[PDB]
Amino acid sequence: SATAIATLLRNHKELKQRQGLFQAKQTDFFRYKRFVRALHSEEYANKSARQPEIYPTIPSNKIEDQLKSREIFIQLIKAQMVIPVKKLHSQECKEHGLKPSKDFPHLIVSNKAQLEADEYFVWNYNP
Incomplete structure (x- = not known):
């Protein structure tokens, strides 16, 4: 059921x-509210x-x-x-021991997942 929904959406x-850099791999990420819009899509x-x-x-x-x-x-x-992830601004990558990429934002694991509208998430699942 978790697997079923994730496979569909x-x-x-x-x-x-979009694609970003997560623990040094290219990873898709999205905002929570846009996932909610996929739950209201006609497919779902x-x-x-x-x-x-x-x-x-x-x-x-x-x-x-x-x-x-x-x-x-x-x-x-x-x-x-x-x-749940943090999307770092370029100036912030040196505080976290990272170097900015021209083509991708850096993402790091977030402390808490309070499911607000523009909270970012990376996919961790490939069907």
Whole structure:
């Protein structure tokens, strides 16, 4: 179910996912709110319409939506298929013992995953 959702949304257009440098490998990363938009995409709606037993349905009441959206994403964090990260500004890479790249931002593991809108996450899963 964590695996099922991640497999379905791993490349979804609404993640607007970019490549960054994570522990020295090129890694896709995205903001939490754009993952929520993939949960509201029509792909997810049709798969939860047919297998609500695997893909949990997103209610329409706005606050049950928010809670069901984070419940789902927390399932991905616990399965270790996404990792919360910090996206470093270039001037910050020397504080962390890194050197900036022209083509990619540096990402480092984040202390806590409080699931705010623009929190960044890297994928840690390839189907």
